[PDB]
Design a protein around this ligand. Structure first.
Ligand SMILES: CC/C=C\C[C@H]1C(=O)CC[C@@H]1CC(=O)N[C@H](C(=O)O)[C@@H](C)CC
Length: 552
């Protein structure tokens, strides 16, 4: 039974005792998983001491073969003491291959604990009506079964399809406007339309608006700009647009629709009153208290447009975690996304921090210093290098408050996509075999994030060893686009939040000219940063042709 003050007091005591809770949490993780051959092979059977001397830092790549066994249905103890109920398909890759992370019942408990904690602080500073609803733009369009018989989904999908999700969120959320059939629609574009319509149908009750990521909220209302008159028509007629073809979705939404020309008129008058859609969100939902979602890190570029739609509504930052697990909660919800920091929850894992040198404990980190995060938790992860670099902004009682700084080895990112030099090189090598058919080779390559388009897209620069046809180059272009298998990139391309990959072919001698540039001053950049004007200049002025992927 949820009690706001009780929840806050519990978080307070835990963070006052963060050092002790860290140690107790490690001991419990090690007890639960002691039969895991990964742990047995380290010499485990001074528990904290033994742990740090016997267990090596490890990377996703090192864990790949172990996790592969779990995805293939091995139920003996490998990374966990008990068989996992699901596997999470993560963003990013494992050396260019799909990256999987175990999803355990404990991770579900953690999710519920963190949501409850964050809600308590948020509802303290931004109290909502408990007879209202929320507009929640969430999606779980798919969860497949591995060949070994294990469910595989994204982390959010594993959360949304958990048997404890509805009951567990009941007390610490405002009820969604959307039918479950919308959330689980196999077609996310239809789901999004229906979320928008559902929100409008209950607009007076909507207490806040949520999506996991800021770019999702922005995409939602950009979409509204396109379909608003269609929604007004659906409401006026009490008939769902023929755009919606998923039968279970049509059925569910039809129960909510009856002819309402009055509401339709209100909405039409309201939309036409806006100036370039400024303040669209509070206009549609005049009782919403805030907009909620991840506003930080890779989402920072989306905040200006989100503010535009949000008008004067507070933007509240959603918490810090990934497919690997949760780390930190926003307990200062009134702070803008620029000032937002996240307090580590001391029982969600045994956290270590590599100085940006060997790792220090949670209560050992220093204000103003940057560290790479190291995770030991209930996801089968022991001293796992997350690759996230954080800065310690301060302490909330004895737990550090963190700001995300950067992700190591990342060169290509628009929103939720994460691609490295190796991923780019692999995509190039894939697409190059279409060229090899023509006895043509890739002389060199680079790339660039083009955010002049909406949405932004990847641009790849190629110089090739000979002239070829448009069809060949079109194929190479499509292949480059499909060769990026990172789940984040694929998810965005499908949801249209990342545009068609563009292949720009440059004139012969273009890359040598870049060499000449650097030689006349005295390692080819694989993604050209916006500030690298001299290099960008040489590439752009030598583009001779341009192609856009017809994939997705
Ligand atoms: C136990 C952890 C449970 C949930 C973590 C996720 C959240 O609910 C908030 C942050 C996080 C987003 C995430 O997992 N994003 C995916 C990813 O980037 O891997 C993406 C492939 C979309 C699902």
């Amino acid at each position: 039974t949820f009690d706001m003050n009780r929840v806050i007091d519990e978080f307070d005591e835990m963070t006052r005792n963060a050092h002790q809770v860290q140690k107790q949490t490690l001991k419990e993780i090690l007890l639960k998983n002691q039969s895991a051959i990964y742990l047995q092979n380290c010499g485990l059977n001074d528990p904290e001491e033994a742990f740090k001397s016997m267990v090596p830092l490890v990377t996703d790549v090192e864990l790949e073969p172990y996790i592969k066994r779990m995805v293939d249905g091995d139920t003996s103890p490998i990374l966990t003491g008990h068989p996992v109920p699901a596997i999470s398909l993560s963003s990013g890759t494992s050396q260019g291959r799909p990256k999987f992370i175990p999803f355990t019942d404990e991770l579900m408990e953690n999710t519920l604990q963190l949501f409850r904690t964050a809600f308590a602080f948020r509802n303290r500073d931004f109290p909502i009506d408990d007879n209202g609803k929320a507009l929640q733009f969430i999606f779980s369009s798919k969860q497949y079964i591995s060949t070994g018989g294990v469910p595989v989904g994204t982390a959010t999908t594993n959360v949304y399809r958990n048997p404890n999700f509805k009951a567990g969120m009941k007390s610490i959320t405002s009820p969604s406007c959307s039918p479950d059939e919308v959330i689980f629609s196999p077609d996310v574009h239809q789901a999004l339309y229906c979320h928008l319509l559902s929100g409008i149908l209950f607009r007076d009750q909507v207490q806040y608006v949520f999506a996991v990521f800021a770019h999702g909220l922005v995409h939602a209302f950009r979409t509204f700009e396109q379909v608003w008159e269609e929604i007004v028509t659906d409401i006026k007629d009490g008939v769902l647009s023929n755009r919606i073809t998923v039968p279970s979705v049509r059925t569910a939404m039809s129960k909510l629709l009856t002819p309402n020309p009055e509401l339709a008129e209100t909405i039409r008058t309201k939309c036409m009153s806006l100036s370039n859609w400024y303040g669209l969100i509070p206009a549609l939902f005049p009782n919403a208290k805030y907009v909620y979602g991840i506003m930080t890190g890779s989402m920072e570029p989306y905040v200006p447009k989100l503010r535009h739609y949000a008008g004067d509504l507070p933007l509240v930052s959603h918490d810090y975690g990934s497919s690997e697990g949760w780390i930190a909660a926003n307990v200062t919800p009134r702070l803008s996304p620029e000032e937002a920091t996240f307090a580590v929850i001391p029982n969600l894992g045994y956290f270590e921090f590599l100085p940006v040198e060997k790792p220090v404990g949670l209560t050992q980190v220093k204000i103003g210093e940057e560290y790479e995060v190291v995770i030991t938790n209930y996801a089968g992860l022991y001293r796992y290098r997350l690759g996230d670099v954080v800065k310690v902004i301060g302490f909330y009682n004895n737990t550090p408050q963190l700001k995300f700084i950067c992700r190591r080895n990342l060169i290509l990112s628009i929103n939720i996509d994460k691609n490295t030099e190796r991923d780019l090189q692999l995509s190039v090598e894939s697409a190059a075999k279409r060229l090899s058919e023509e006895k043509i080779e890739v002389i060199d390559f680079s790339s660039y994030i083009d955010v002049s388009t909406d949405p932004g897209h990847y641009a790849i620069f190629w110089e090739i060893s000979g002239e070829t046809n448009e069809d060949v180059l079109q194929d190479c272009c499509n292949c480059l686009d499909r060769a990026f298998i990172d789940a984040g990139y694929v998810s965005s391309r499908k949801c249209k939040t990342i545009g068609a990959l563009e292949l720009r072919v440059v004139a012969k001698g273009t890359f040598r000219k870049i060499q000449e540039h650097f030689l006349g001053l005295g390692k080819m950049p694989r993604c050209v940063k916006p500030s690298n004007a001299k290099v960008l200049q040489i590439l752009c002025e030598n583009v001779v042709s341009s192609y856009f992927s017809t994939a997705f």
